[PDB]
Enzyme design. Structure first.
Site, PDB file in Angstrom:
ATOM      1  N   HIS A 192      42.013  33.782  43.277  1.00 43.03           N
ATOM      2  CA  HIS A 192      41.875  35.122  42.638  1.00 43.03           C
ATOM      3  C   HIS A 192      41.324  36.137  43.642  1.00 43.03           C
ATOM      4  O   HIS A 192      41.641  37.322  43.527  1.00 43.03           O
ATOM      5  CB  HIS A 192      40.949  35.005  41.416  1.00 43.03           C
ATOM      6  CG  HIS A 192      41.461  34.014  40.418  1.00 43.03           C
ATOM      7  ND1 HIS A 192      42.637  34.214  39.744  1.00 43.03           N
ATOM      8  CD2 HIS A 192      40.935  32.859  39.969  1.00 43.03           C
ATOM      9  CE1 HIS A 192      42.835  33.204  38.923  1.00 43.03           C
ATOM     10  NE2 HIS A 192      41.840  32.342  39.075  1.00 43.03           N
TER      11      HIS A 192
ATOM     12  N   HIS B 106      32.435  39.255  46.857  1.00 43.25           N
ATOM     13  CA  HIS B 106      33.894  39.224  46.943  1.00 43.25           C
ATOM     14  C   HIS B 106      34.407  40.643  46.804  1.00 43.25           C
ATOM     15  O   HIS B 106      33.645  41.551  46.535  1.00 43.25           O
ATOM     16  CB  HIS B 106      34.483  38.342  45.858  1.00 43.25           C
ATOM     17  CG  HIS B 106      34.184  38.817  44.477  1.00 43.25           C
ATOM     18  ND1 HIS B 106      33.017  38.455  43.822  1.00 43.25           N
ATOM     19  CD2 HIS B 106      34.820  39.686  43.670  1.00 43.25           C
ATOM     20  CE1 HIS B 106      32.974  39.101  42.670  1.00 43.25           C
ATOM     21  NE2 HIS B 106      34.051  39.901  42.574  1.00 43.25           N
TER      22      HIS B 106
ATOM     23  N   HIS C  58      37.955  43.175  45.387  1.00 43.61           N
ATOM     24  CA  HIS C  58      39.219  43.415  44.669  1.00 43.61           C
ATOM     25  C   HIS C  58      39.971  44.475  45.445  1.00 43.61           C
ATOM     26  O   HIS C  58      39.289  45.402  45.940  1.00 43.61           O
ATOM     27  CB  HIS C  58      39.006  43.855  43.206  1.00 43.61           C
ATOM     28  CG  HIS C  58      38.101  42.966  42.448  1.00 43.61           C
ATOM     29  ND1 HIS C  58      38.607  42.013  41.581  1.00 43.61           N
ATOM     30  CD2 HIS C  58      36.764  42.834  42.434  1.00 43.61           C
ATOM     31  CE1 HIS C  58      37.538  41.353  41.038  1.00 43.61           C
ATOM     32  NE2 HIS C  58      36.390  41.801  41.578  1.00 43.61           N
TER      33      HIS C  58
ATOM     34  N   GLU D  39      38.312  48.493  40.820  1.00 45.39           N
ATOM     35  CA  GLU D  39      38.210  48.158  39.367  1.00 45.39           C
ATOM     36  C   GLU D  39      37.557  49.317  38.640  1.00 45.39           C
ATOM     37  O   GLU D  39      38.149  49.905  37.759  1.00 45.39           O
ATOM     38  CB  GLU D  39      37.404  46.874  39.226  1.00 45.39           C
ATOM     39  CG  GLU D  39      38.133  45.696  39.841  1.00 45.39           C
ATOM     40  CD  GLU D  39      37.821  44.371  39.222  1.00 45.39           C
ATOM     41  OE1 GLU D  39      36.676  43.998  39.184  1.00 45.39           O
ATOM     42  OE2 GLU D  39      38.762  43.695  38.734  1.00 45.39           O
TER      43      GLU D  39
ATOM     44  N   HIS E 166      31.987  43.553  45.349  1.00 45.83           N
ATOM     45  CA  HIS E 166      31.056  43.079  44.321  1.00 45.83           C
ATOM     46  C   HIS E 166      30.070  42.089  44.937  1.00 45.83           C
ATOM     47  O   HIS E 166      30.468  40.986  45.319  1.00 45.83           O
ATOM     48  CB  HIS E 166      31.803  42.421  43.166  1.00 45.83           C
ATOM     49  CG  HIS E 166      32.567  43.409  42.380  1.00 45.83           C
ATOM     50  ND1 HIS E 166      33.608  43.057  41.527  1.00 45.83           N
ATOM     51  CD2 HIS E 166      32.473  44.742  42.342  1.00 45.83           C
ATOM     52  CE1 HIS E 166      34.092  44.151  40.998  1.00 45.83           C
ATOM     53  NE2 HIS E 166      33.408  45.227  41.426  1.00 45.83           N
TER      54      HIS E 166
ATOM     55  N   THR F 298      34.511  40.979  35.316  1.00 49.09           N
ATOM     56  CA  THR F 298      35.842  41.623  35.278  1.00 49.09           C
ATOM     57  C   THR F 298      36.937  40.590  35.369  1.00 49.09           C
ATOM     58  O   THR F 298      38.092  41.012  35.370  1.00 49.09           O
ATOM     59  CB  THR F 298      35.973  42.660  36.399  1.00 49.09           C
ATOM     60  OG1 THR F 298      36.017  41.969  37.652  1.00 49.09           O
ATOM     61  CG2 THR F 298      34.884  43.712  36.362  1.00 49.09           C
ATOM     62  N   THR F 299      36.608  39.304  35.472  1.00 54.70           N
ATOM     63  CA  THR F 299      37.602  38.204  35.420  1.00 54.70           C
ATOM     64  C   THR F 299      37.191  37.289  34.295  1.00 54.70           C
ATOM     65  O   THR F 299      36.012  37.195  33.939  1.00 54.70           O
ATOM     66  CB  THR F 299      37.673  37.420  36.717  1.00 54.70           C
ATOM     67  OG1 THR F 299      36.410  36.803  36.896  1.00 54.70           O
ATOM     68  CG2 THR F 299      37.973  38.276  37.907  1.00 54.70           C
TER      69      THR F 299
HETATM   70  C1  LIG Z   1      36.587  34.044  36.996  1.00 55.86           C
HETATM   71  N1  LIG Z   1      35.352  33.494  37.503  1.00 55.86           N
HETATM   72  C2  LIG Z   1      35.229  32.039  37.417  1.00 55.86           C
HETATM   73  C3  LIG Z   1      33.753  31.727  37.578  1.00 55.86           C
HETATM   74  C4  LIG Z   1      33.082  31.531  36.244  1.00 55.86           C
HETATM   75  C5  LIG Z   1      33.557  30.594  35.335  1.00 55.86           C
HETATM   76  C6  LIG Z   1      32.855  30.313  34.177  1.00 55.86           C
HETATM   77  C7  LIG Z   1      31.675  30.971  33.909  1.00 55.86           C
HETATM   78  C8  LIG Z   1      31.218  31.940  34.780  1.00 55.86           C
HETATM   79  C9  LIG Z   1      31.920  32.222  35.937  1.00 55.86           C
HETATM   80  C10 LIG Z   1      34.340  34.162  38.160  1.00 55.86           C
HETATM   81  O1  LIG Z   1      33.622  33.619  38.977  1.00 55.86           O
HETATM   82  N2  LIG Z   1      34.228  35.479  37.867  1.00 55.86           N
HETATM   83  C11 LIG Z   1      33.217  36.355  38.313  1.00 55.86           C
HETATM   84  C12 LIG Z   1      31.980  35.876  38.713  1.00 55.86           C
HETATM   85  C13 LIG Z   1      31.020  36.753  39.151  1.00 55.86           C
HETATM   86  C14 LIG Z   1      31.280  38.114  39.236  1.00 55.86           C
HETATM   87  C15 LIG Z   1      32.512  38.602  38.819  1.00 55.86           C
HETATM   88  S1  LIG Z   1      32.800  40.360  38.862  1.00 55.86           S
HETATM   89  N3  LIG Z   1      34.327  40.606  39.299  1.00 55.86           N
HETATM   90  O2  LIG Z   1      31.891  40.929  39.848  1.00 55.86           O
HETATM   91  O3  LIG Z   1      32.606  40.832  37.524  1.00 55.86           O
HETATM   92  C16 LIG Z   1      33.487  37.727  38.349  1.00 55.86           C
HETATM   93 ZN   LIG Z   2      34.511  41.259  41.142  1.00 56.73          ZN
END
Ligand SMILES: CN(CCc1ccccc1)C(=O)Nc1cccc(S(N)(=O)=O)c1
Ligand SMILES: [Zn+2]
Ligand code: NA
Length: 258
Positions: free
Chosen positions: A62, A92, A94, A104, A117, A196-197
């Site tokens: 991703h 990370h 986007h 985003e 982020h 946001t994911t």
């Molecule tokens: C999609 N997942 C899978 C990991 C996951 C899986 C299960 C529970 C909790 C986390 C994920 O890590 N997202 C994520 C994590 C931290 C920050 C952001 S953001 N873009 O800054 O809002 C997105």
């Molecule tokens: Zn993010």
């Protein structure tokens, strides 16, 4: 048939596996700069990254994550809208297929080329997995990227990406200093939101810096050579890995500045 950013599994589909996608505090949002209110009670942000310990860089299918040792208070975010101490776990980005999109959050509907982020978790919950179950579990520092001059502190990230081209690849990534990714000003907007994911959990205090960083066209072009696919799968470039702005609903965006 897992979530992603394609026609068949992109953001408009996510609500079928993750109904919280249509929730009351989803991210990202459009930041209407005229409606945001100055909150003279908000504190300066405290970003203490001098002892940050990077470990590894991972292509997770991703985005790519630069991961940190979060087993001690070594790189922490405090102050601003936050109560207590939030530990840096990973950062990370986007980004877009074109310089005209990728962020985003938006600012008066303006899209930036990319968004960084820096993810932190509230130490009162003991670890990241417990923190994401709490409404004040995470603090994500968001920084916009615009295309212009190179960001010298980004180049060590750019140069390792050839070693993690495909999903599930990782590389050692020690001694990376995330202070080299910050703009001069820590002026910000803040609001309560979500990941946001998927799983789109409503656990984030968002802190979005007003001042973007500049990166070069060559730096972002290297992000766009990454792959969503695993090795030995059909090549799908990792581009447009952003969720669009979600309804603000019953929320106010607060500004740290006049
Ligand atoms: C999609 N997942 C899978 C990991 C996951 C899986 C299960 C529970 C909790 C986390 C994920 O890590 N997202 C994520 C994590 C931290 C920050 C952001 S953001 N873009 O800054 O809002 C997105
Ligand atoms: Zn993010
Ligand atoms: Na104004």
């Amino acid at each position: 048939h897992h979530w992603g950013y394609g026609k068949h599994n992109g953001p408009e589909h996510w609500h079928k596996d993750f109904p919280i996608a249509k929730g009351e505090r989803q991210s990202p949002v459009d930041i209407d700069t005229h409606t945001a209110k100055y909150d003279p009670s908000l504190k300066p942000l405290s970003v203490s990254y001098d002892q940050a310990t990077s470990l590894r860089i991972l292509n997770n299918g991703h985005a790519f994550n630069v991961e940190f040792d979060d087993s001690q208070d070594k790189a922490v975010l405090k102050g601003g809208p936050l109560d207590g101490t939030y530990r840096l776990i990973q950062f990370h980005f986007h980004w877009g297929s074109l310089d005209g999109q990728g962020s985003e959050h938006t600012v008066d509907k303006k899209k930036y080329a990319a968004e960084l982020h820096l993810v932190h978790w509230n130490t009162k919950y003991g670890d990241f997995g417990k923190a994401v179950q709490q409404p004040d579990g995470l603090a994500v520092l968001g920084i916009f990227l615009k295309v212009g001059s190179a960001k010298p502190g980004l180049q060590k990230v750019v140069d390792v990406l050839d070693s993690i081209k495909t999903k599930g690849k990782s590389a050692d990534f020690t001694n990376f200093d995330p202070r080299g990714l910050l703009p001069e000003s820590l002026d910000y907007w803040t609001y309560p939101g979500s990941l946001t994911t998927p799983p789109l959990l409503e656990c984030v205090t968002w802190i979005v810096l007003k001042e973007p960083i500049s990166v070069s066209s060559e730096q972002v072009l290297k992000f766009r050579k990454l792959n969503f696919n695993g090795e030995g799968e059909p090549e799908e470039l990792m581009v447009d890995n952003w969720r669009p702005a979600q309804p603000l609903k019953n929320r106010q965006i607060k500004a740290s500045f006049k």
